[PDB]
Amino acid sequence: TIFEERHLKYISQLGGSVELCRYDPLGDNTGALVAVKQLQHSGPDQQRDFQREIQILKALHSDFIVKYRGVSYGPGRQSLRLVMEYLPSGCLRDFLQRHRARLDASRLLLYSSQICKGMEYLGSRRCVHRDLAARNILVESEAHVKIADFGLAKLLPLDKDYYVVPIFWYAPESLSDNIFSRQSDVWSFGVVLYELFTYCDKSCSPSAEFLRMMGVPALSRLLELLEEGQRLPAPPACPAEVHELMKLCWAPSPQDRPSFSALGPQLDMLW
Ligand SMILES: CC1(C)[C@H](Nc2c(C(N)=O)cnn3cc(-c4ccccc4)cc23)CC[C@]1(C)N
Structure with missing residues (x-):
């Protein structure tokens, strides 16, 4: 210590x-x-x-x-x-790309569930992560992942639920009013589910795809695209149930997004 x-x-x-x-x-x-x-x-x-x-x-x-x-x-x-x-295995981003062939949907779901339980614990302690992405998650072992990078992490005061401080992991409220909360962490989680089920493939990364759909400043265009209700597509061969959960994580209003506690049992039943 x-x-x-x-x-x-x-x-x-x-x-x-x-x-x-x-x-x-x-x-x-x-x-x-x-x-x-x-x-x-x-x-x-x-x-x-x-x-x-x-x-x-x-x-x-x-x-x-x-x-x-x-x-x-x-x-x-x-x-x-x-x-x-x-953690010698390194970040989940590289690991997913190096080991695609042996990582099936149940394995991706096991990681998803673990990230979730970890995010659920962070909210419990009043911690907003602000930088939730596959690049910030580390592999402990074959069936074990950990959340890392606490450099942008902020502790919420006891009487407030939000904080005012790549653009593809940010929630619409973070993009327009720089409002960060556990509800914005959930948005980022949906992008993490998307990254996992794309095996962090660069050609269908949240950036490569959102820019494709995009084409005024790039941030405004993305935010316009999001306001319109356009979303990242379901990853190639993604189980439909997994893609519906990402679309809940991507609800336009923060109150509509599921809680980490609510998402937990959903990802467990899916295995
Ligand atoms: C915050 C991180 C996740 C990294 N930090 C790491 C931590 C840590 N405590 O933060 C622990 N173990 N670790 C292993 C690798 C690593 C990567 C590739 C290959 C081998 C090993 C990277 C890291 C530094 C930058 C990062 C990637 N955003």
């Missing part, structure tokens, strides 16, 4: 910057691999942004949320970094 900087051996970059270090106190190259995050931008707003990320992760205890391992300790105030666990 307090890692010495001198023992954090740099290996490569993954992602503020997210690095792959080995926590090697012995200095022998046998220590555990860790995911270490730090901001390149110095400042009082940046320090607050990164302090907020740490406090959020430190109090999150789900099997479906990337494990916080601790904070760094080195020479100077500038040396402090966030230490999380490393």
Whole structure:
């Protein structure tokens, strides 16, 4: 929960910057691999942004949320970094593309259900994620996924249900009025269901398809297209039941969107 900087051996970059270090106190190259995050931008707003990320992760205890391992300790105030666990399989985006052939619909549904239970837990703690996408979900093992990237995550105050702060994961209210809530996370979840059932194929990615349907500023056009009720199409060979759930996640009004708690049993019955 307090890692010495001198023992954090740099290996490569993954992602503020997210690095792959080995926590090697012995200095022998046998220590555990860790995911270490730090901001390149110095400042009082940046320090607050990164302090907020740490406090959020430190109090999150789900099997479906990337494990916080601790904070760094080195020479100077500038040396402090966030230490999380490393998942060798990497992001679900790459994993889906590398292993298509062995990932069937029940498997995609098992991941969908786990992401959901994880999103359900985040709402429980009053946490809006703001960056829910396959690129931000990590593979723990064959039948296990975790939610990561808490850099844009905001905690909702006790007396409010929303927060005022790629465009293809944003809800219509986020696009027009920069309103973020658990209801906007659900919209992003529908795009995640879509990404999963497309195996994160680049040629039918939310971007490639929405831009195709699009053709004034690009954001306004997308928002016009969404206002009209146009949506991403059902992924090639997507079970119809799965596509209906995405269309509920994509309800124009936030009150109409199902809750994560409500979506959970639906994805479980589907397997
Ligand atoms: C927030 C992430 C999901 C990444 N962070 C990662 C974390 C973490 N704690 O945030 C943990 N394990 N991990 C493994 C990979 C990885 C990818 C490909 C290949 C191998 C390994 C990337 C990450 C950095 C940037 C990201 C992708 N948006």
